Enzyme design. Structure first.
Site, PDB file in Angstrom:
ATOM      1  N   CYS A 139      -0.487   4.166   2.421  1.00 21.01           N
ATOM      2  CA  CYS A 139       0.730   3.600   3.011  1.00 21.01           C
ATOM      3  C   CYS A 139       0.930   2.163   2.610  1.00 21.01           C
ATOM      4  O   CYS A 139      -0.046   1.473   2.328  1.00 21.01           O
ATOM      5  CB  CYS A 139       0.735   3.765   4.524  1.00 21.01           C
ATOM      6  SG  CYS A 139       0.572   5.487   5.067  1.00 21.01           S
ATOM      7  N   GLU A 173       0.278   7.445  -2.398  1.00 27.29           N
ATOM      8  CA  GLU A 173       0.212   8.773  -1.792  1.00 27.29           C
ATOM      9  C   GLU A 173       1.616   9.198  -1.370  1.00 27.29           C
ATOM     10  O   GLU A 173       2.146   8.704  -0.379  1.00 27.29           O
ATOM     11  CB  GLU A 173      -0.778   8.763  -0.611  1.00 27.29           C
ATOM     12  CG  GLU A 173      -1.242  10.134  -0.143  1.00 27.29           C
ATOM     13  CD  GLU A 173      -2.302  10.094   0.942  1.00 27.29           C
ATOM     14  OE1 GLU A 173      -2.139   9.310   1.903  1.00 27.29           O
ATOM     15  OE2 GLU A 173      -3.297  10.849   0.835  1.00 27.29           O
TER      16      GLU A 173
END
Ligand SMILES: COc1cccc(OC)c1S(=O)(=O)Nc1noc2cc(Cn3cccn3)cc(OC)c12
Ligand SMILES: [Zn+2]
Length: 272
Positions: A139, A173
């Site tokens: 993140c 990701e």
């Protein structure tokens, strides 16, 4: 629901609902310590806490510091409350942020703008400690008041400095936030152009470029494509050197400059 948050000198409308305690989330406006990320139910509690709280920065060590800019390598297993708190602040702006509780298996790189009042949280990126399918970022977040100031570029650049120095190419990701998507593209375009200039009249493969940058090959070809600089040599995706675009970027770069830029020489520790 929640709706607005009090963070330091700013009041910020949330974009998403973050799973906070039933009594705290219910509230119209949620109060928070810009140094410890502790949530409080009222303006008066906050002020009482700001007299007690001895924190004027995150509970970690500086992996990086240059001038007013700091990167705090916050270990999820060590200062676990703060990290769980950071994930809750994160989820207010990041839609796809699923991990909020089991923070111990992760690292949190916390960017701060520093002054007399302390080390003010700008944003962060999280990294898994051991990830074989290697995502250099799980993140990445930037508090709205800081979005588009170049702090987002800085983190992306720092995440690649970490990942590239430990020999492997990396990616964030997926699925990214649309602003995260937009910031990654901007970065890749600048990096490839700047890197091609520092080769200048030196033909380099997409594999070598990926080695030098730390950007994974697929991310390079999609970016070269967008740059109108991609082609084929059978089983070989290749770089079309639009040398005028490379010289023009470098020109604008000396001009406009970088406000926040990673100095690899200002790192406390880099991998091997
Ligand atoms: C849009 O990105 C640009 C674009 C142009 C210029 C520019 O800089 C001059 C930048 S940025 O370099 O400042 N990066 C960011 N700005 O806002 C961001 C937001 C996020 C994710 N998020 C979602 C919610 C909270 N945070 C991630 C980001 O980057 C990882 C950035
Ligand atoms: Zn506090």
């Amino acid at each position: 629901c929640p709706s607005v948050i009090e963070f330091g000198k700013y009041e910020i409308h949330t974009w998403y609902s973050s799973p906070y305690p039933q009594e705290y989330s219910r509230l119209p406006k949620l109060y928070l310590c810009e140094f410890c990320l502790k949530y409080m139910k009222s303006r008066t509690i906050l002020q009482q806490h700001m007299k007690k709280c001895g924190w004027f920065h995150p509970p970690a060590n500086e992996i990086y510091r240059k001038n007013n800019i700091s990167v705090f390598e916050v270990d999820g297993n060590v200062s676990t409350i703060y990290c769980q708190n950071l994930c809750l602040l994160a989820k207010l702006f990041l839609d796809h942020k699923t991990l909020y509780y089991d923070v111990e298996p992760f690292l949190f790189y916390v960017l701060t703008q520093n002054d007399v009042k302390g080390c003010h949280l700008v944003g962060y990126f999280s990294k898994e400690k051991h990830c074989q399918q290697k995502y250099n970022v799980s993140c990445i977040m930037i508090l709205p008041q800081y979005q588009r100031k170049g702090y987002g570029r800085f983190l992306i650049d720092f995440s690649y400095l970490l990942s590239k120095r430990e020999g492997q190419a990396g990616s964030p990701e997926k699925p990214l936030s649309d602003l995260g998507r937009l910031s990654y593209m901007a970065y890749w375009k600048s990096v490839i152009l700047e890197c091609l200039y520092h080769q200048n009249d030196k033909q380099i493969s997409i594999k070598k470029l990926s080695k030098l940058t730390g950007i994974c090959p697929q991310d390079i070809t999609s970016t070269l494509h967008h740059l109108r600089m991609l082609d084929f040599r059978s089983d070989q995706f290749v770089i079309i050197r639009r040398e005028k675009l490379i010289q023009d970027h470098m020109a604008k770069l000396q001009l406009n400059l970088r406000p926040v830029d990673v100095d690899p020489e200002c790192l406390r520790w880099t991998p091997v």
